[PDB]
Amino acid sequence: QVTLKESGPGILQPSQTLSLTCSFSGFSLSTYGMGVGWIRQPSGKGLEWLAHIWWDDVKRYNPALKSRLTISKDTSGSQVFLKIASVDTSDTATYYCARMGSDYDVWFDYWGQGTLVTVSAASTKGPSVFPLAPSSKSTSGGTAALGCLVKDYFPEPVTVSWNSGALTSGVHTFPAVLQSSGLYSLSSVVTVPSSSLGTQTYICNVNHKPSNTKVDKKVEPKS
Amino acid sequence: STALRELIEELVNITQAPLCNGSMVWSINLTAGMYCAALESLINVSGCSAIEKTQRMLSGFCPHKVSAGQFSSLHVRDTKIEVAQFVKDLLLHLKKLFREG
Amino acid sequence: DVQITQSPSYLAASPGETITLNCRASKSISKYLAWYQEKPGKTNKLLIYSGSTLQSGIPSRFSGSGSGTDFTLTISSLEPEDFAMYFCQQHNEYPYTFGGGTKLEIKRTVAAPSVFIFPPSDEQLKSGTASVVCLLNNFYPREAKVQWKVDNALQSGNSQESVTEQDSKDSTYSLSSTLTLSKADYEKHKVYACEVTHQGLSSPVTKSFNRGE
């Protein structure tokens, strides 16, 4: 039924202007009582309300940011937009849009999944993908482990699936670590039956949107 | 405004029971001095205890005293409506002021 | 401008337990506090608003209470799906403000890790760097130590690790640790070994390989 989804730039340079889009189904901002807000979360920190807008164009803005923000909707009331002028690194956060659960009061009955925005001067860099091959020293109790090392990318995030989503069970994709080089690295693993390693194919599907880098890497016994 | 929220909440409570049982008031422009206008239009409803708290709550937002039995006009372009319709209209205007801040 | 504190920010409990979470405002917010449930790979879910009003379709084992400055969310007879991050939000006053959340995690019995060690790939070595990875799979509790040795030399400061969130199936954690060397250093040594200590293990477990084999 009701869904919301944020779309954004992925990464931008300081002093730039962040433009965010919220698309949604299951309601319109032309129906009475409908409205949408923008909330953000810097990593390891708490949520912060930014701005919201109602079906009749009444808008509110967080006074700490008031001047940098502009919120809007289209005439078809099917999308909502936030602009943040003059971004700096303090604007690096996950950005959520969310629907107001009331016709006057400000709590949120439905939220989007959120989109990461990194504000940095550093260049975008796509990862290298290396196999974590199954062996004997990754094999115990009829189970072997294998995976993919996704190395040396910027900014976050990367997604990793296994056999285009055919493998659900046993997958662990770890949080990225920021390496001393200023680049991220992550591991994704899957544990699988040892006896089928000769007759099953394992492919990690890696995607780094900021660099437009997609890689499907086969992981096989050996080397 | 806590006061504003309380009033909205009281209107929501009282119009959720047909408010003032076959009493009619004149409409007004509520976009201009809303609170006093609403009190002026509601102050003369005479046998409805359900509206008393509302009347008191509205007096808190008007910067002059609103007395019963006063002359306004002969309400030529105006129109008689049920108290409930009036109050539900008032509620919409109040919610917008709340939403506006 | 109201500051919202949730303390403590971490709780562990076993299913079926009844627990309470606290939320505190820096000044009165009448009764206008909302509670939301946060889960990895899910959208945030509104549970309660106006202090105590249960959102439609939320089970009645969620109960919100409080007024003024001190608020509680009580979750009675915790189900497995009830373990999550819970945050509050005052909606009394502009600007609207959120608490920093409390992570509610399942207590369960100790489970020992299954440990796997991976050599760097030939592909990687072509670029001049070697990552050696140690995996600890599906253990509980979170606390674990990995010790890296290369030809019995204890490696210190040249590894990084990260840990998954509690698994939705067995409540365990997993850990990945990456040792970084130059290809040149990698090819100077034979025995790469990852030694793991964990409450679930009577004695440390070591997985090793010999560069070559």
DSSP string, chain A: --EEEEE--SEE-TT--EEEEEEEES--TTSTT-EEEEEEE-TTS--EEEEEEETT--EEE-TTTGGGEEEEE-TT-SEEEEEE-S--GGG-EEEEEEEESSSSS--EEEE---EEEEE-SSPPBPPEEEEE---STTB-SSEEEEEEEEEEEBSS--EEEEGGGT--TTEEEPPPEE-TTS-EEEEEEEEEESTTTTT--EEEEEEEGGGTEEEEEEE-S--
Q: Of C124, C146, C121, C125, which is closest to residue C135 (Cα–Cα)?
A: C146
Q: Classify the C-alpha dihedral C101-C106-C107-C113 as positive or negative.
A: negative
Taking CA atoms, what residue in A is nearest to C116? A138
Find out whether C164 and C137 touch, Cβ atoms under 8 Å. Answer: no
Token pair in block for residue C100: 């920093």
Q: Do residues C78 and C7 share a domain?
A: yes
What is d(CA C16, CA A141) in angstroms, rounded to the nearest whole number?
Answer: 32
Find out whether C30 and C82 touch, Cβ atoms under 8 Å. Answer: no
SS3 C207: strand
Helix (H) or strand (E) segment spanning residue C141: none
Using a CB–CB cutoff of 8 Å, tell me whether A142 touches chain C: no
Domains of chain A by range and CATH? 1-121 (2.60.40.10), 122-220 (2.60.40.10)
**Which residues in chain C are closer than 8 Å to A111, comparing Cβ atoms?**
43-45
What is d(CA C98, CA A107) in angstroms, rounded to the nearest whole number?
Answer: 11
**Contact state of B95 with A103 under an 8 Å Cβ cutoff:** yes
Using a CB–CB cutoff of 8 Å, tell me whether A103 touches chain B: yes
Residue recorded with tokens 């440390």: C204
What is d(CA A194, CA A178) in angstroms, rounded to the nearest whole number?
Answer: 33
Q: Do residues C32 and C101 share a domain?
A: yes
**Which residues in chain A are closer than 8 Å to C3, comparing Cβ atoms?**
none
**Contact state of A172 with C163 under an 8 Å Cβ cutoff:** no
Token pair in block for residue C171: 């409540």
What is d(CA A130, CA C123) in angstroms, rounded to the nearest whole number?
Answer: 7
CATH assignment of the domain containing C169: 2.60.40.10
Sheet strand arrangement including C62-67: C4-5, C19-25, C70-75, C62-67
Q: Do residues C162 and C100 share a domain?
A: no
Residue recorded with tokens 């949408």: A36
Q: Which of residues 47-106 of A touch C (CB under 8 A)?
A: 47-49, 60, 62-64, 96, 98, 101-102, 105-106
Domain boundary among C108, C124, C139: C108
Token pair in block for residue A1: 């039924």
Residue A27 CB burial class (10 angstroms; 0-12, 13-18, ≥19): buried
**Contact state of A177 with C137 under an 8 Å Cβ cutoff:** no
b/e sequence C95-121, b meaning 16+ C-beta within 10 Å:
bbbbbbbbbbbbeeeebbbbbbbbbbb
CA atoms within 13 A on the CB side of C124: 29
Q: How far is CA A2 from CA A25, A105, C16, C185, in A?
A: 6, 19, 31, 56
The C-alpha angle C151, C175, C100, rounded to 5 degrees, equals 140
**Contact state of C55 with A109 under an 8 Å Cβ cutoff:** yes
How many C-beta atoms lie closer than 10 Å to residue A39's C-beta?
A: 25
| Pairing verdict, β A18-25 and A79-84 | antiparallel
Q: Do residues C178 and C100 share a domain?
A: no
**Which residues in chain B are closer than 8 Å to C30, comparing Cβ atoms?**
2, 5
What is d(CA B25, CA B51) in angstroms, rounded to the nearest whole number?
Answer: 13
Token pair in block for residue A102: 């009331």
Neighbouring subunits of B (3+ Cβ pairs under 8 A): A, C
Domain boundary among C54, C86, C108: C108
Would you give the DSSP letter of residue C192? E
Query: Which residues in chain A are immediately followed by a break of C to N over 2.5 Å?
Result: none
Q: Of A87, A199, A137, A169, which is closest to residue C207 (Cα–Cα)?
A: A137
Q: Do residues C125 and C66 share a domain?
A: no
Q: Of B48, A104, B77, which is closest to residue B87 (Cα–Cα)?
A: B48
Token pair in block for residue A40: 């953000």
DSSP C50-99: TTTEEPTTS-TTEEEEEETTEEEEEE-S--GGG-EEEEEEE-SSSSPEE-
Q: Note down the domain range covering C206.
A: 109-213
Residues facing C191 on adjacent strands: C210
**Which residues in chain A are closer than 8 Å to B96, comparing Cβ atoms?**
56, 58
**Which residues in chain B are closer than 8 Å to C92, comparing Cβ atoms?**
2
Of C30, C92, C94, the CB nearest to B101: C94
Q: Do residues C141 and C207 share a domain?
A: yes
Instruction: Give residue A129's Cα distance to chain centre.
Output: 20
Using a CB–CB cutoff of 8 Å, tell me whether A54 touches chain B: yes
Find out whether A129 and A151 touch, Cβ atoms under 8 Å. Answer: yes
Q: How far is CA A43 from CA A47, A84, A90, A193, A194, in A?
A: 10, 19, 11, 37, 38
**Which residues in chain C are closer than 8 Å to B2, comparing Cβ atoms?**
30, 92
Of A63, A137, A172, the CB nearest to C209: A137
Using a CB–CB cutoff of 8 Å, tell me whether A112 touches chain C: yes
Using a CB–CB cutoff of 8 Å, tell me whether C125 touches chain A: no
What is d(CA C94, CA B48) in angstroms, rounded to the nearest whole number?
Answer: 35
Taking CA atoms, what residue in A is nearest to C94? A62
Helix (H) or strand (E) segment spanning residue B8: helix B2-15
**Which residues in chain C are closer than 8 Å to A63, comparing Cβ atoms?**
95
Q: Do residues C114 and C213 share a domain?
A: yes
**Contact state of A60 with B96 under an 8 Å Cβ cutoff:** no
How many structural domains are present in chain C?
2
Find out whether C55 and C47 touch, Cβ atoms under 8 Å. Answer: yes
Residues facing C57 on adjacent strands: none
CATH class assigned to B1-101: mainly alpha
Token pair in block for residue A7: 């779309």
Amino acid letter, A55 = W
Q: Do residues C163 and C123 share a domain?
A: yes
Residues facing C136 on adjacent strands: C115, C175
Interface of chain C toward chain B, CB-CB under 8 angstroms = 30, 92, 94
Q: Do residues C11 and C83 share a domain?
A: yes
- What residues does each domain of chain B span? 1-101
Helix (H) or strand (E) segment spanning residue B92: helix B83-100
Q: Of A125, A78, A116, A76, which is closest to residue A96 (Cα–Cα)?
A: A116
Q: Do residues C76 and C129 share a domain?
A: no
Token pair in block for residue C210: 């010999």
**Contact state of C46 with A108 under an 8 Å Cβ cutoff:** yes
Residues facing C208 on adjacent strands: C193
Resolution to 1 decimal, in Å? 2.0
Domain boundary among C85, C108, C131: C108
Using a CB–CB cutoff of 8 Å, tell me whether A158 touches chain C: no
How far is A104 from chain B, CA to nearest CA, in Å? 6
Find out whether C196 and C204 touch, Cβ atoms under 8 Å. Answer: yes
**Which residues in chain A are closer than 8 Å to B99, comparing Cβ atoms?**
54, 58, 60, 104
Write out B18-60 in H/E/C secondary structure. Answer: CCCCCCEEECCCCCCCHHHHHHHHHCCCCCCHHHHHHHHHHHC
The C-alpha angle B16, B18, B24, rounded to 5 degrees, equals 125
Q: Enumerate residues 6+ apart whose C-beta is below 8 A from C169.
A: none
Q: Do residues C159 and C73 share a domain?
A: no
Q: Enumerate residues 6+ apart whose C-beta is below 8 A from B15.
A: B84, B87, B88, B91
Q: Do residues C83 and C27 share a domain?
A: yes
**Contact state of B2 with C94 under an 8 Å Cβ cutoff:** no
Q: Classify the C-alpha dihedral A172-A157-A6-A217 as positive or negative.
A: negative
How far is A108 from chain C, CA to nearest CA, in Å? 7
